[PDB]
Amino acid sequence: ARVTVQDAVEKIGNRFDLVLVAARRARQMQVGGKDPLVPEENDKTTVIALREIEEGLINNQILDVRERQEQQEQEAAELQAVTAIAEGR
Amino acid sequence: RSPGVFFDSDKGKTHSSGKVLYNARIIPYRGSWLDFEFDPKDNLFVRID
Amino acid sequence: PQSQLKLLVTRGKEQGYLTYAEVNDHLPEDIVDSDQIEDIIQMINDMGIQVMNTADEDAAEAAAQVLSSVESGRTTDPVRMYMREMGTVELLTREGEIDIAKRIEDGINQVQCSVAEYPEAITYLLEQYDRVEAEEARLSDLITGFVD
Amino acid sequence: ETLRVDPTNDRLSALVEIYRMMRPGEPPTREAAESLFENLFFSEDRYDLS
Amino acid sequence: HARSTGSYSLVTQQPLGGKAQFGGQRFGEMEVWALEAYGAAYTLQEMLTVKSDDVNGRTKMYKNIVDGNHQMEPGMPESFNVLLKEIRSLGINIELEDE
Amino acid sequence: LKAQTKTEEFDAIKIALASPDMIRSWSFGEVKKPETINYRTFKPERDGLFCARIFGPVKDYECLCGKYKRLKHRGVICEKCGVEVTQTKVRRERMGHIELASPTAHIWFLKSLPSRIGLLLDMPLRDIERVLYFESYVVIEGGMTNLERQQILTEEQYLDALEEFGDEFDAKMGAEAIQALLKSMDLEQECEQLREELNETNSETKRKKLTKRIKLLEAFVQSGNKPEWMILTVLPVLPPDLRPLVPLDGGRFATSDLNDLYRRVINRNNRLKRLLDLAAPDIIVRNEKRMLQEAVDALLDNGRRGRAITGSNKRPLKSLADMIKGKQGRFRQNLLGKRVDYSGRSVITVGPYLRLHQCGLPKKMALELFKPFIYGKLELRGLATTIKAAKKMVEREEAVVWDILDEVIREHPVLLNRAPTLHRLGIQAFEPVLIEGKAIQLHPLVCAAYNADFDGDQMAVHVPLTLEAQLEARALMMSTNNILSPANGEPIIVPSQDVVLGLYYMTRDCVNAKGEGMVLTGPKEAERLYRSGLASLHARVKVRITEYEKDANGELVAKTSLKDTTVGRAILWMIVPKGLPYSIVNQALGKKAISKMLNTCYRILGLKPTVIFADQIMYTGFAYAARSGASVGIDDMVIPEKKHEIISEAEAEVAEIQEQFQSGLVTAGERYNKVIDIWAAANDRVSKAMMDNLQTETVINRDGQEEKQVSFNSIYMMADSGARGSAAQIRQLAGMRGLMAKPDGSIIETPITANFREGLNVLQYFISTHGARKGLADTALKTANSGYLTRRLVDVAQDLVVTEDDCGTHEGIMMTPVIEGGDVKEPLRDRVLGRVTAEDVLKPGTADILVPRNTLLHEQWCDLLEENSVDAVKVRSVVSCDTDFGVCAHCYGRDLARGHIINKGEAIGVIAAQSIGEPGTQLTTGGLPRVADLFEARRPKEPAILAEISGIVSFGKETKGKRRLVITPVDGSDPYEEMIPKWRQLNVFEGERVERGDVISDGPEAPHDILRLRGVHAVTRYIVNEVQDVYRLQGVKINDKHIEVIVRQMLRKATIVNAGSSDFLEGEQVEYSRVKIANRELEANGKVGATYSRDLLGITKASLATESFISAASFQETTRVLTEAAVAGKRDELRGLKENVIVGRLIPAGTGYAYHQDRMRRRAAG
């Protein structure tokens, strides 16, 4: 278990934003679109996310960048599909 | 409170005058209350219940 | 020599506090109502409260309290205003009943005669009875019976 | 001084004022004032100290 | 005593024990202040919305709880909606603006 | 893009008057019949209070008559009886209406002492009522003839006036009259006249009321409301499901009183329609109209009038306003409390084996609580076919499920809460540990925060369902994450009783023992020496220890030496982590020292070390306390040998003064005082006998004859260590106890000479009884008092939350030590600790900046200031913060559960109020009511009057009621003359000059005076110092911060003086004002900016001012608030805590602050 979030708070200083960001990440894992960035000790997605905050490999900037990238990951797929929609003309 | 007549004061707080006050109360076992009470002008009063 | 409500007010202000019983009797002989008090404790309470902590504005909480004192007669309770409003109407005399009833008779019979002097009022009845015997209607829906 | 603050004059007047105090809003009656006042502290029915 | 999901009151939908299975603990104003002093909004929202007063929110939540997904889709508590209707039943028009 | 129509996530709310057509919009049908149900087939009679056609189907997706019962047919309106088949929930939604035959006044607007119709029409109430009941006529638009427009007439008067003028004169009576009045009224014209009339005549009385009314009028105009709507045409009917007819056992029904009321209204209205069609005489139809008015009024708010009673039941039927108001004070359902799922409760136990971060949770309880999670996991791994099977499994309690539970419990925290919740620590999150039993195991160190004894107190558990709730619980509400009181930085995890007696008995020394004087390599073989029975736990010994220090930059330095200590302290040192000095464990280790140990550990090593250290401290405490064999015997309480003698001599004194009273040498009162004084002295004598005797009396020998030290006597160890008991109570055990007072409050001159160890005879006990009962009652009362204070306080603060980061103001208050009377009743370091510097301060020499500008002053910094001789520091405060509508973190301070500076978005008003109110139980002019009077701004009974202006003064006029004091300013004029009642003894020198805010008399001073005459900082200092005097006198620690925020809320308003933007005398927000002038100092008029005056408002008065009406409708009087807001068409934008709590969405603070921020910015923008 994660007894003290002091280090996670140390990384992102707001400490409410810690809860928010860690929640976002814990969601990325819980209903799986993704997988952990740190070894899972059987710790639930909550604690895994907190650990990920502690190791500095996860935060608002990083997550936003990843999601914005994924928008174009899917945009590249539909590239032919939606351009086939020229029927709007 | 036992049925009968009862004499009280209400000294101090009443009208903040330090003049005190005095009231008698007739409390029946069953029936209406008969109250007698003074005022700062020293005029005796009566109230039923 | 007189004006009542000042008096409970002016005393309630200088003492700074008045018992819930203090206002009841000190109230004028005019407003005795039970639910009267309900809002007026809220009136005196924002200005110098005793409900037995407020607004120091006062002012209009007096002028409107004097408006409620002038508003202190009519107790409402429509049983009352009714019992009083009908209590004005004078009792009928045994002959007066006959007078009024005769007047009624005069009126109605007037409108009936006025009906009988209208040709269409006749023709309509004729055509309606023509519909009755034609099984397009019934006798009960035309006449209640004649004189008979 | 109490008498000087007394608005009434005779027995009937006082009875009217008492009846009006107990049951206000409604017109007083002689028989009503007498009945009430006698029925308050003087009645064997409505009053007992035991 | 303990409760997860029990019966509910008809007038306002709120947890009520009818079976001797007990109703939930009452979360009061002081407790709300306690959650307010802490930075926890979500604990409070789920406390007074989904776990209790939201007729949709409770079931919609339960399905997620069993699905393995922890979220909430809060909606509007039934108490405040009842108060909307009670206020609006008078000559008072109360509206929810904008978008 | 098209904005939207259908349901989205809405913003704010609007409230206003309803149009007849607007009312008809909600209504899906008119209820024309008083009937409810068919009486045999319980189905609703068509178009009646309960109806399927108008409102909805009695069963889901099923038509009434039963034609279309299929879930397929939906938008179909049946041909037999039109009912659209839809969920029965829409019977809880769809409204209804009634078309009233005659107009009817809306009682809320008619009488809610702003009689709204009245002050809108400038027409007195009694006239309006006299009209409504047809007790007189009232003119309407009288044109030009003989008469005023608002003028009222009588029967004869109306007939006469009508005979004189047939037309160009108009009068009506009843509701129709008031309606015609309101409708005819043109607001514009009235405005146009009022402005001119305002401008012409000069009188206070005239233009005050004039300007007030014109303001009211233009407000009503901008509202969008129209006067006619105050008079009801259409009367909406509430949905049937909200006033259920639902059945019960034994065939009996039960229903809301709203059905009775609505039934009355409907019946009387219908009878009025009939009487209109039958052409009844006026005497009748009037009576029916009055009855209708009564019916409607009773239906809306039955509070007023005569309170009609429900059928067969004496109790008055509850009306709609009584439905909104509710009862039990001011409680709106989201306030008083709410039943919540996923929760529980039970009796609690100890569980010392627990870590600070966990709590024992009963097996069965955890099973029932996590049931949905258990189902989900069970069918997630595949142990169960379907959800039903999972239910059946856990209902069977098959051996497997337990392990599954162990999975769902692991990282999933639970919430623990106690009954008297005051400070935020009242609810704390833990990690569940499965337990066999029905009781909840609660960590000992937390027992302080909860104020929870083990005598049968119960605690409640909650489950943080959503992910955000689990993470909120772990990163905020977690036990280990809050180790510090929010009131003051001191540790709340301080060991309580058994543990401190353990560390006390451990760390301590007697004169001679086993292994006295020997030497050992380290703590290891010290403990090894003790556990083998070779060396005594407490013995004077030199041992080699290695202590570290982090004093190098970011780096631990190691050093080792020979310390003179005891075996026990050496053993205890094994626990002490890293850089802490040995000096901390080398003392006697009392409850205070053991606390400062943890505190220093936290401000040095950080959080985690402090936590685990605390745990180990608890474990070793309980351990060695157990080993100690500490007990309490009857011989442990030692009565002074000299007690009886003191009693005798003091008993001689009373006979001396008695004989003096017998000889008339002394008066009665003087005798009384004398005897009471001699006994009062005797008490202290015996006390300070038993105290010495119980303290140092142990006389023991080391290698010599004798020597003496602090006693190892049990009860003394308990009282001294801080475990439990105190000199006051020990005094009552051994020495005599006090003098008692009769219920009158007259203290008896024959004190109780017997103590508890001795037997108390009948009298003494009977006399003790009074004090006992008064104690119980008074405490039980001060509970409620404390609670009430907390309520007023949270009501006055609430929405205040850290919003900006740094306002960047140099402004602040000057912090010096209190220096009261003799030396230092409170230091400087405490006052300035955890606070930011306003400006860079200096050494005694300058061009040397030690603390630069704004820097949070922490332990090291304050110690640096302590190194230097610095006597004062200017500190930024919440009261001086330039940020509008909140506080910037830079100004607030640091203190929290964490030593770091306050977070952005933390709600500080709530925790301020909580922190002020929580200790308030311990408070006893003086006392708790003193605190209340202070926060209430109330002027004292017999106050002192300050000098209105500086300069030489003189006593003018003569005696009538007052003797006037005339001031003489040097340069300025002297319009100021204050009439000071002369029967009050003065102070001011008639031949001397006095500065503004000097003492022109003695006695207490009204804080309003301090604010106006002296200053904002002066008064903000007065409050905080006075309330802190009250608290500190009782030994209570409350940081100046909280009180300072309460003060900030107190002075929130102000009254304008000059003009050029807003009105003259308006009380208004300093925030609004300052925003408008700082905005007006540039652009606009070059500067038109208006002057103001800051105003002190009592907390209960300041709480009255709130922008959100949903908020105000909670704690204030509901009816008046709703009405007063409705006529103004006030639009509640939410934005506050309370309103968002009521509406049931994320709080505009804490975690939800990001949401509300982003949303607030998206709104009022592109």
Ligand SMILES: [Mg+2]
């Ligand atoms: Mg207890």
Ligand SMILES: [Zn+2]
């Ligand atoms: Zn049908």
Ligand SMILES: [Zn+2]
């Ligand atoms: Zn600031």
